[PDB]
């Protein structure tokens, strides 16, 4: 009878930071997808193996919500296939994803005058996630042949930079927060229907 | 006996088309019944489409379809290379699965129809459709 938290997720205070993305599994609750298709705030709402406007038809094991802060050139790197520093690096779907990725413009709220730097993106690593893996790790990176030692210098990187939001800076520049959706379909009773 | 190869899967949006194909390797293939089915998550495989044997001395072919498909999907046959396609037309959102193509020795122009009735079996290819 108790509806889905999908406010908790979609309108939390704070969000994570694309390199610590956050995750919330959704189970044994009556979903109403109808708040998010009708609604005019999201500038993306792209569905892979589901139709959205079918989505209150539908029954699930399990809903999973992902959500962090990205800018607004790299929504679409969230898409199965995809490459680039945050497929690659921060947050990676699988081939075979059956889910909804919803990203809105947050430069109201996530971008300060003189900068937002509390938003970070991995922007090296040895080599890529694997679908949905996540990496909070924060060691120097080696871009060259010589070692770091630890320490930051020549082709030896902090691994996290800043986005730096302004609320001047181009569209394609301000933050946009985005929560993917993952239909989970087992051989097992669903517990997340619509009405 | 029979090596099975699927390969042309991808992402596309809804309306869009794709085209798999499959090769097998072996003998046995010419005489087997060979057709594609597909499994989406948390479901068991189910039949999509199926092509009859090669016959000496006809040219006649069989076919069979999973009813949603119909006239959306076509199976087709090469001559003497032994490569099965599926073109795959007004592709929808509940299309997305794991396409898998099978081979069945068989008799005639029979085709069969269900997964426990093909022997061999390639190891899928991934099909994602999308809508805005
Ligand atoms: C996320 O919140 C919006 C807006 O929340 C409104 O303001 C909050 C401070 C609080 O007072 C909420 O209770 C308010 O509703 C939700 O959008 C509203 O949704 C309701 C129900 O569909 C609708 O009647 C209102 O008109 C909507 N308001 C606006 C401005 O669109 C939205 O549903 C919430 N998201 C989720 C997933 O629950």
């Known amino acids: 009878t108790n509806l889905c938290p999908f406010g908790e997720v979609f309108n939390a205070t704070r969000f994570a930071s694309v390199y610590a993305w956050n995750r919330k599994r959704i189970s044994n609750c009556v979903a109403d997808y109808s708040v998010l298709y009708n609604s005019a705030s999201f500038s993306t709402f792209k569905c892979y193996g589901v139709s959205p406007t079918k989505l209150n038809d539908l029954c699930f094991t399990n809903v999973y919500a992902d959500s962090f802060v990205i800018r607004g050139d790299e929504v679409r790197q969230i898409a199965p296939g995809q490459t680039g520093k945050i497929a690659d690096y921060n947050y990676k779907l699988p081939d075979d994803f059956t889910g909804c990725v919803i990203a809105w413009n947050s430069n109201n709220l996530d971008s300060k005058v003189g900068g937002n730097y509390n938003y970070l993106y991995r922007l090296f690593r040895k080599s890529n996630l694997k679908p949905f893996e996540r990496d909070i790790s924060t060691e120097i990176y080696q871009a060259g042949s010589t070692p770091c030692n630890g320490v930051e210098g020549f082709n030896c990187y902090f691994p996290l930079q800043s986005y730096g939001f302004q609320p001047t800076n181009g569209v394609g520049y301000q933050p946009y927060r985005v929560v993917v959706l993952s239909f989970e379909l087992l051989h097992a009773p669903a517990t997340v229907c619509g009405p | 006996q029979v090596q099975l190869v699927e390969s042309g899967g991808g992402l596309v949006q809804a309306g869009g088309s794709l085209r798999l194909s499959c090769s097998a390797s072996g003998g046995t293939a010419s005489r087997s019944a060979m057709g594609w089915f597909r499994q989406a998550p948390g479901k068991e495989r189910e039949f999509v489409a199926g092509?009859?044997?090669?016959?000496?001395?006809?040219?006649?072919?069989?076919?069979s379809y999973e009813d949603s498909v119909k006239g959306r999907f076509t199976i087709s046959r090469d001559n003497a290379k032994n490569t099965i396609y599926l073109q795959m037309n007004s592709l929808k959102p509940e299309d997305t699965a794991v396409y898998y193509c099978?081979?069945?020795?068989?008799?005639?122009?029979?085709?069969?129809?269900?997964?426990?009735?093909?022997?061999?079996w390639g190891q899928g290819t991934q099909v994602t459709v999308s809508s805005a």
């Open positions: 092509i009859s044997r090669r016959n000496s001395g006809s040219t006649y072919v069989a076919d």
């Open positions: 099978a081979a069945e020795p068989t008799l005639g122009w029979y085709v069969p129809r269900r997964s426990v009735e093909y022997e061999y």
